[PDB]
């Protein structure tokens, strides 16, 4: 193909969007933005498929062009805007705020947060570099650049950005005993305490994470996102607290819920 592609097929779209195989040939190709194509959630998917606020893409367009949706405190009118991990979606007309946080099944949840929690977010620092008269710069997972970071912040750490100002307020080091989410791979959406890190020079480091329920798993270092200091998260967790139940336990819980409900 010559030049960039501009379409995304319905069946070739990311699976975690949970799209049909009969409601059209195309899936909304997310715009270029702070998050990768396969790791984002387009605004049209969130407003139409998730929140049911629209029944068509035209209604999503109307909602977005009335300037009602803020992403990280800034109004976005792009219906294919790539919203991703740790982002904040504010709808002041209905007075709600959501955070984009993975379920244990690896899918972005509809996780409502308080209006005072929507004033900040967490960003994993992807790199730190000194430029142009020795000014340190930091690049996070939102592709946002922060000048003059704390000289203690290193790669793989987490920083709490104030959305109003864009400045760093606090940070969590990447160390054992710290809480972390998994943002990719088979264990995507799981939360647990870092127990170990195997360094593999010239290759991918492997980080071992222990669940709150004693379960253990491993991921690549790029798939780890430090959520809180110690075992206390700095953000509100979804319904499941990052505990991946086996299929049997999920079936048992569903049967208990059926018994209690009908």
């Amino acid at each position: 193909a010559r030049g960039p592609k501009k379409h995304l097929k319905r069946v070739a779209a990311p699976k975690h969007w949970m799209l049909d195989k009969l409601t059209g040939v195309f899936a909304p190709r997310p715009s270029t933005g702070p998050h990768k194509l396969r790791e984002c959630l387009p605004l049209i998917i969130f407003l139409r498929n998730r929140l049911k606020y629209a029944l068509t893409g035209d209604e999503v367009k109307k909602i977005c062009m009335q300037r009602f949706i803020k992403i990280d405190g800034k109004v976005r009118t792009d219906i294919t805007y790539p919203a991703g991990f740790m982002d904040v979606i504010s709808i002041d007309k209905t007075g709600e705020n959501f955070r984009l946080i993975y379920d244990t099944k690896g899918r972005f949840a509809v996780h409502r947060i308080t209006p005072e929690e929507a004033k900040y977010k967490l960003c994993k620092v992807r790199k730190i570099f000194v430029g142009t008269k020795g000014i340190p710069h930091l690049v996070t997972h939102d592709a946002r650049t922060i000048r003059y970071p704390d000289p203690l912040i290193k790669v793989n750490d987490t920083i709490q950005i104030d959305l109003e100002t864009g400045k760093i307020t606090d940070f969590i080091k990447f160390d054992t005993g710290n809480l972390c989410m998994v943002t990719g791979g088979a264990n995507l959406g799981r939360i647990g305490v870092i127990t170990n890190r195997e360094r593999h020079p010239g290759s991918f480091d492997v980080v071992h994470v222990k669940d709150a329920n004693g379960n253990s798993f491993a991921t690549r270092l790029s798939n780890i996102f430090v959520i809180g200091k110690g075992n206390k998260p700095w953000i509100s967790l979804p319904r499941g607290k990052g505990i991946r139940l086996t299929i049997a336990e999920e079936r048992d819980k569903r049967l208990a819920a059926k018994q209690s409900s009908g």
Partner: protein, 124 residues
């Protein structure tokens, strides 16, 4: 024997200035209830004028029992005209579709591609 209206999955859409619901119609011995009759029944049920109520997609189940469709109740007629699809407005007599066809517009557009300037307005 009376047609009965029920509202199943109700939501207040302040973003689109309306209310959305799934309408269940019980007509045990009658044909599929006309969209008008449902509009007045919902207007009675939600205490509103019937002309802010747009109902669509009514599928009658097998066996002749209930019919399930969707409904919107707009805050005002102006908001309905701003937010509704043009065809659902034309169903209420609030919009007139273009009187031409696709072929005529396409061949006209390709005819004006040959003329340049103000003469582009003389082709039709």
């Amino acid at each position: 024997d009376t047609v009965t209206i029920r509202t199943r999955k109700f939501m207040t859409n302040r973003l689109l200035q309306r209310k959305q619901m799934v309408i269940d119609v019980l007509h045990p011995g009658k044909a599929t209830v006309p969209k008008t009759e449902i509009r007045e029944k919902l207007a009675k049920m939600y205490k509103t004028t019937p002309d802010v109520i747009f109902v669509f997609g009514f599928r009658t189940h097998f066996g002749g029992g209930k019919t399930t469709g969707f409904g919107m109740i707009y805050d005002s007629l102006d908001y309905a005209k701003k937010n509704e699809p043009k065809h659902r407005l034309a169903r209420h007599g609030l919009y007139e579709k273009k009187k031409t066809s696709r072929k005529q517009r396409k061949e006209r557009k390709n005819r004006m591609k040959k003329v340049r300037g103000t003469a582009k307005a003389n082709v039709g």
